[PDB]
């Protein structure tokens, strides 16, 4: 780990000393204890890149504030993580080496769960597992909404615009109220929490005046120390389904049919249409169907589909509510797809495998945290992953163009194509997942190169990334370049106003601050 | 109209001159032509307050930018309005006298309406009437969501956190993408619009990085020149209803029953439970039931209820979707209230009056713009109104405490109590509307005083205002005072960074800028 540029050993040493006084000497980590904070899915081949210098683990908001005041005095940068499980995005590691990680794992109090109003107020350390377990224990009739990684932070995930698979799938949309330590060490509360004596912090997003909560998501404009989130009341009924399509070209008409269903909200959760290999790899690995080094051939695809009762495309969704509602919505959904040759429709009871994609996703779509999804990392013997999830119109043409662009490249590079088409509400994402051997330098180099080209080519077709790995944060920022990067010039203006010393997470979302820019 | 403090006649004159060059001499207004921009509902008795000095009406974004550059050179403040129909909030008038109004009425292009994706991209001048009429003409299967004032701006209303009465009732929540002229004259686009070549500006809110759209709502951080908004697909069915309650104390149990219905979204639009007089005054005036100068007595309330088939509380709501869905949801809603003594349930066909509250609200709850609501201003012979709409928990106790606090004061002051309980999703608002004779100085003084006391007393019970009249913008801002006004210190930090010369709308949301603070 290099020192961060511009920062002396005397400075970094005096700071680490004062941090230790603030949080106690037990909660300042260095040297050997810093490896948990390295990116678990190494992309770079240069070991001077994305290296944390140290980590400090405060117990409270006020300790966070003192840390930040100290960081300001010594010019030492901080990289805040809630729990730091941002796997595929860098884990807990900074964009910039020398950055001291601010690990808020120990701030894990569930401050409130309110059944009657359907919310929680949580600290950054609270995991999905913990919140879920708290709810189950108290018997509250509330669902949470989990990403495929159950170990993540409710806070951290939402601040990064993460998603899940219930009607409450847009995590940051369900955010309501936050406490923030600003980069100068001042503490503020957004919304109704700015009003002393309110009982409305988790009931009404705006409060009064400029709506600023969003500026602390995908941002280095502050450290979030408390955050509210809305929780769905247990519904009166729940039916998960899987609809399979046999032909790779079906995704065009499938996307066309999904469009009105999503816009009108007939489909109540995110639509996910996953490619064969991405779904297969939940229950199977490559060597069980194909011994070659290259991607699987069509004949092997067909075998896999026949074994697993999957298609080339697999649409998982769920119905929620009283049976009459669920039946009516299902009529509309099923009728939208029934005339496509080869289509098949499944509820859980129709699956003949007891370990099965639908049975797994059934849990995720009712907000049960699991680690099952990490299975796809075993596809080629064990590896890391990176994901590329640009936004596009919900159009057949856009869906199949991205499929064609991505699969051809990915397969040319020797990887299997693992993709899905995700629809939030009016937004389509073609999500590429590439599993690679992160221990092999030749494979990292190929991945890095493939990734860049995918990004470049997608951007030119008008498809921009909304969430990315620490390594590509600058690159993605350059996508949004209208009027000579006018938006990022504004971000930098706010950055310098709130963080003149540039001590919060230099490089996050490609925002640097005047000192490093 | 006084000059704005700190600004010379030479400066104000050179600026008005350069504005005229930018937009043409026809589109700079002064003296007599400035009266349309006065508050129509005068509250102040001091005619030096909230007076606009001049108004300038650009044709384009780029003209806006040149105006702003000129404003910066001469230190002349601007007050931007989309259409300036903010009736009950000041209309088009500035907080601070001497402020030149930036009227964007002529920027009224509907840039796009997309049926397949359910959105519009509009300029600030577009009215609800215009957008509605455009849709009807083209035969697009889309609803809009209108406030009770149909003459408002789709943009302006949303930026002020305005509301309506369909499922798309939270206007700023449905906002997606905006173009903004910053206070330095630079132009930026938020979200996917920052990415050149996107077709996704109105499909995905976030883009990448800090989510900043909200900072330009209830704000003087920029001028919005284009804005996207999501539009609901025409639903498969629509049944509006009215549920009446006979007793003033029923609102307690009514609010308790509404809570789970709203949180779970069984009620698909905003719930509005309006008091007798507020609903009566849509079709009747006071002198038709009572000749006294004071508020109506109970005996007269009873007569009105029996004439109009209204209760002391009137819950308007609507069902949306296929009949099976609507029936199922109605079963849950009706069962939630059926056991309350005196309760009555109406669909349109059950109303015996052809001019009737439900028949009016039926239109509003399917997004048809109307001016009918302004009828309540005739309650006591013709007047203005002001509204007070603080947030509270959805609780019977909170509902009836606010009813008791407000009605007693309002009636003591000689006004009739006109109130409603509004529920967005998890948020209750007790909304006080007070109709007053705006031409009478004694009545203005009483109103102003009543308003202050209501605000003070509500704040102490933990109920804070989310939207207010230009006159009370500072006052409401002081509500949100946690940690020595930490939030507003942050607002002011951003204000000085984006607007160092303080030329955009000094005082909006009680944000002033370093020059005037
Ligand atoms: C197999 C697999 C499946 C995945 N599935 C999903 C999925 O379905 N949905 C999804 O959203 N993601 C998914 N991910 C990505 C990721 O693992 C999750 O999003 C995870 O929840 C994020 O980590 P975290 O919650 O611990 O957040 P953190 O790592 O704590 O935070 C993420 C980032 O947010 C910022 N941040 C966090 N806390 C603060 C704070 N208090 N103040 C300021 N900034 C802060 C920082 O930039 C930080 O680096 C997946 C990854 C893998 C490998
Ligand atoms: C009887 C009655 C009923 C009402 N019912 C409702 C209702 O149901 N729902 C509701 O929401 N309101 C309601 N109102 C309040 C108000 O009339 C409406 O909200 C109206 O739609 C707002 O005016 P406008 O749309 O022309 O916005 P504008 O007056 O153009 O804008 C409002 C404010 O937003 C800011 N602003 C506007 N445009 C920009 C921009 N481009 N850049 C920067 N800042 C900008 C300014 O501060 C401006 O003063 C009601 C009022 C009355 C008297
Ligand atoms: Cl969704
Ligand atoms: Cl084996
Ligand atoms: Cl079913
Ligand atoms: Cl709503
Ligand atoms: Cl008459
Ligand atoms: Cl019905």
Short mmCIF file of C-alpha atoms in Angstrom, two decimals, chain A residues 116-118 161 168 170 172-174 179 182 187-200 202-204 206-212 214-219 221 230-233 259 263-264 322 324-325 328 391-395 425-427 429 459 461-468 473 476-477 479-483 486-488 490-491 493-494 497-498 509-511, chain B residues 116-118 161 168 170 172-174 179 182 187-200 202-204 206-212 214-219 221 230-233 259 263-264 322 324-325 328 391-395 425-427 429 459 461-468 473 476-477 479-483 486-488 490-491 493-494 497-498 509-511:
data_model
loop_
_atom_site.label_atom_id
_atom_site.label_comp_id
_atom_site.label_asym_id
_atom_site.label_seq_id
_atom_site.Cartn_x
_atom_site.Cartn_y
_atom_site.Cartn_z
CA UNK A 116 -47.86 -0.12 11.46
CA UNK A 117 -46.08 2.36 9.13
CA UNK A 118 -43.93 -0.24 7.32
CA UNK A 161 -28.67 2.52 -6.32
CA UNK A 168 -39.81 -2.62 -3.34
CA UNK A 170 -35.55 0.12 -6.23
CA UNK A 172 -32.92 4.10 -3.00
CA UNK A 173 -36.50 4.95 -4.07
CA UNK A 174 -37.68 3.37 -0.80
CA UNK A 179 -28.43 11.38 8.95
CA UNK A 182 -20.70 16.23 6.02
CA UNK A 187 -23.98 16.50 11.13
CA UNK A 188 -27.30 17.08 9.31
CA UNK A 189 -30.60 15.29 9.01
CA UNK A 190 -32.65 15.37 5.84
CA UNK A 191 -36.40 15.64 5.38
CA UNK A 192 -38.58 15.71 8.47
CA UNK A 193 -35.60 14.65 10.60
CA UNK A 194 -34.40 18.26 10.34
CA UNK A 195 -37.46 19.17 12.37
CA UNK A 196 -36.91 18.44 16.12
CA UNK A 197 -39.76 16.48 17.74
CA UNK A 198 -41.04 14.92 14.45
CA UNK A 199 -42.37 11.37 14.28
CA UNK A 200 -42.36 11.61 10.49
CA UNK A 202 -39.55 7.73 7.84
CA UNK A 203 -43.02 8.78 6.57
CA UNK A 204 -42.38 11.65 4.18
CA UNK A 206 -39.12 15.63 1.14
CA UNK A 207 -39.45 17.63 4.29
CA UNK A 208 -39.31 21.22 2.98
CA UNK A 209 -36.96 22.99 0.59
CA UNK A 210 -34.39 21.40 -1.77
CA UNK A 211 -34.58 17.62 -1.85
CA UNK A 212 -30.98 16.62 -1.10
CA UNK A 214 -30.07 11.88 -3.52
CA UNK A 215 -26.84 13.90 -3.47
CA UNK A 216 -25.49 11.41 -0.86
CA UNK A 217 -26.16 8.38 -3.08
CA UNK A 218 -23.32 7.27 -5.40
CA UNK A 219 -21.42 10.14 -3.86
CA UNK A 221 -20.51 14.41 -0.49
CA UNK A 230 -39.76 1.66 3.59
CA UNK A 231 -40.79 -1.96 4.09
CA UNK A 232 -43.58 -3.74 2.25
CA UNK A 233 -46.46 -5.09 4.40
CA UNK A 259 -43.11 -3.28 -22.21
CA UNK A 263 -45.21 0.43 -17.73
CA UNK A 264 -48.74 -0.21 -16.43
CA UNK A 322 -55.24 -11.51 -2.89
CA UNK A 324 -58.48 -12.60 -7.42
CA UNK A 325 -55.85 -9.88 -8.08
CA UNK A 328 -56.39 -11.38 -13.06
CA UNK A 391 -29.89 1.54 -19.38
CA UNK A 392 -31.84 1.24 -22.64
CA UNK A 393 -35.46 1.66 -23.87
CA UNK A 394 -37.77 -1.33 -23.32
CA UNK A 395 -37.69 -2.35 -26.97
CA UNK A 425 -40.45 0.13 -14.49
CA UNK A 426 -39.79 2.02 -17.74
CA UNK A 427 -36.10 1.07 -17.87
CA UNK A 429 -31.04 -3.11 -18.62
CA UNK A 459 -22.16 4.00 -25.04
CA UNK A 461 -25.45 2.95 -29.21
CA UNK A 462 -26.80 5.26 -26.47
CA UNK A 463 -26.67 2.84 -23.50
CA UNK A 464 -25.12 4.21 -20.32
CA UNK A 465 -24.05 2.45 -17.14
CA UNK A 466 -25.75 3.40 -13.86
CA UNK A 467 -23.58 1.45 -11.38
CA UNK A 468 -19.98 0.23 -11.73
CA UNK A 473 -15.81 4.89 -12.03
CA UNK A 476 -18.44 5.57 -16.58
CA UNK A 477 -18.46 9.24 -15.52
CA UNK A 479 -20.11 8.62 -20.54
CA UNK A 480 -22.24 11.48 -19.21
CA UNK A 481 -20.33 14.13 -21.13
CA UNK A 482 -23.08 16.33 -22.62
CA UNK A 483 -21.93 19.97 -22.93
CA UNK A 486 -21.35 20.04 -17.63
CA UNK A 487 -22.95 17.72 -15.07
CA UNK A 488 -19.62 16.59 -13.57
CA UNK A 490 -21.46 20.83 -11.26
CA UNK A 491 -20.69 17.75 -9.13
CA UNK A 493 -18.51 22.58 -7.71
CA UNK A 494 -20.61 20.97 -4.94
CA UNK A 497 -18.06 23.55 -1.46
CA UNK A 498 -18.83 20.68 0.90
CA UNK A 509 -18.28 8.26 -9.16
CA UNK A 510 -15.33 9.98 -10.80
CA UNK A 511 -15.63 13.03 -8.53
CA UNK B 116 -45.49 3.37 -25.44
CA UNK B 117 -43.26 4.45 -22.52
CA UNK B 118 -45.87 6.63 -20.77
CA UNK B 161 -43.75 19.26 -4.56
CA UNK B 168 -49.50 9.45 -10.04
CA UNK B 170 -46.84 12.85 -6.13
CA UNK B 172 -42.11 15.37 -8.27
CA UNK B 173 -41.85 11.59 -7.69
CA UNK B 174 -42.99 11.12 -11.30
CA UNK B 179 -32.54 20.54 -18.14
CA UNK B 182 -27.44 27.06 -13.32
CA UNK B 187 -26.69 24.55 -18.80
CA UNK B 188 -26.77 20.96 -17.49
CA UNK B 189 -28.93 17.91 -17.99
CA UNK B 190 -29.60 15.43 -15.22
CA UNK B 191 -29.81 11.65 -15.34
CA UNK B 192 -29.47 9.95 -18.70
CA UNK B 193 -29.83 13.32 -20.45
CA UNK B 194 -26.21 13.99 -19.48
CA UNK B 195 -25.32 11.16 -21.83
CA UNK B 196 -25.36 12.34 -25.50
CA UNK B 197 -27.32 10.03 -27.83
CA UNK B 198 -29.52 8.51 -25.06
CA UNK B 199 -33.18 7.65 -25.63
CA UNK B 200 -33.57 7.08 -21.89
CA UNK B 202 -37.50 9.96 -19.40
CA UNK B 203 -37.05 6.23 -18.59
CA UNK B 204 -34.56 6.14 -15.73
CA UNK B 206 -30.80 8.37 -11.65
CA UNK B 207 -28.36 8.24 -14.50
CA UNK B 208 -25.04 7.71 -12.67
CA UNK B 209 -23.45 9.44 -9.69
CA UNK B 210 -25.11 11.83 -7.20
CA UNK B 211 -28.85 12.13 -7.71
CA UNK B 212 -29.32 15.90 -7.99
CA UNK B 214 -34.26 17.06 -6.17
CA UNK B 215 -31.94 19.97 -5.40
CA UNK B 216 -33.80 22.01 -8.08
CA UNK B 217 -37.21 21.42 -6.47
CA UNK B 218 -38.37 24.01 -3.90
CA UNK B 219 -35.10 25.73 -4.68
CA UNK B 221 -30.26 26.54 -7.20
CA UNK B 230 -44.17 9.93 -16.17
CA UNK B 231 -47.75 9.47 -17.35
CA UNK B 232 -50.10 6.70 -16.27
CA UNK B 233 -51.38 4.37 -19.03
CA UNK B 259 -53.59 3.56 7.74
CA UNK B 263 -49.44 1.67 3.56
CA UNK B 264 -50.25 -1.53 1.63
CA UNK B 322 -59.81 -4.44 -14.29
CA UNK B 324 -61.97 -8.14 -10.55
CA UNK B 325 -59.12 -6.02 -9.09
CA UNK B 328 -61.47 -7.07 -4.54
CA UNK B 391 -46.98 16.30 7.84
CA UNK B 392 -48.02 13.96 10.66
CA UNK B 393 -48.20 10.18 11.33
CA UNK B 394 -51.29 8.38 9.97
CA UNK B 395 -52.87 8.06 13.40
CA UNK B 425 -48.70 6.84 1.14
CA UNK B 426 -47.31 6.77 4.69
CA UNK B 427 -47.86 10.50 5.29
CA UNK B 429 -51.55 15.90 6.24
CA UNK B 459 -44.67 22.74 14.99
CA UNK B 461 -46.73 19.05 18.36
CA UNK B 462 -44.16 17.81 15.80
CA UNK B 463 -46.04 18.70 12.57
CA UNK B 464 -44.00 20.50 9.93
CA UNK B 465 -45.10 22.23 6.74
CA UNK B 466 -43.81 20.92 3.40
CA UNK B 467 -45.08 23.66 1.05
CA UNK B 468 -45.95 27.30 1.81
CA UNK B 473 -40.99 30.73 3.45
CA UNK B 476 -41.34 27.41 7.57
CA UNK B 477 -37.58 27.06 7.05
CA UNK B 479 -39.18 24.79 11.60
CA UNK B 480 -36.38 22.52 10.37
CA UNK B 481 -33.89 23.77 12.93
CA UNK B 482 -32.28 20.57 14.26
CA UNK B 483 -28.64 21.17 15.27
CA UNK B 486 -27.64 22.50 10.21
CA UNK B 487 -29.67 21.60 7.11
CA UNK B 488 -30.17 25.24 6.03
CA UNK B 490 -25.83 23.21 4.09
CA UNK B 491 -28.42 24.67 1.69
CA UNK B 493 -23.22 26.38 1.36
CA UNK B 494 -24.57 24.94 -1.92
CA UNK B 497 -21.20 27.61 -4.53
CA UNK B 498 -23.71 27.56 -7.37
CA UNK B 509 -37.47 28.28 0.74
CA UNK B 510 -35.74 30.71 3.07
CA UNK B 511 -32.41 30.34 1.25
#
